[PDB]
């Protein structure tokens, strides 16, 4: 029943859709990789924080980290060009990501594409 090669990689999505999707599920520390919109062969790393924007009744704040792609590698903010998103993401899944302000984005739930129905 739909058994094959699954993963977190989505394909096409906009920072506007992610925030809606990620939140829709309601899973903290949920990251999802999507293709850029106005960037050259680039991607965007969207992660759902376990912290609400307001309080009890508001959606979880998301973090869009511009993902740079150098030919066949990936990086964010720094030069560290991972062999692939699988490594760049995994490394963060254990270590995590640090935002300028200080926020620590953790990736434990590999947001899967999901059967787009409806």
């Amino acid at each position: 029943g739909s058994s094959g090669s699954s993963g977190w990689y989505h394909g096409h999505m906009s920072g506007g859709q992610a925030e809606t999707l990620l939140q829709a599920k309601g899973e903290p520390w949920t990251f999802l990789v999507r293709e850029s919109l106005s960037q050259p062969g680039d991607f965007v790393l969207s992660v759902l924080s376990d912290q609400p924007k307001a309080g009890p009744g508001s959606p979880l704040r998301v973090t869009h980290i511009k993902v740079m792609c150098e030919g066949g590698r990936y990086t964010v903010g720094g030069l560290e060009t991972f062999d692939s998103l699988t490594d760049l993401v995994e490394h963060f899944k254990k270590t995590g990501i640090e935002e300028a302000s200080g926020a620590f984005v953790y990736l434990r739930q590999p947001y899967y594409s999901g059967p787009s129905s409806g």
Partner: peptide, 15 residues
Amino acid sequence: ATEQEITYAELNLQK
């Protein structure tokens, strides 16, 4: 107008 241009986080590194 009233567009939705989400902002990205400016991670911090050696830089």
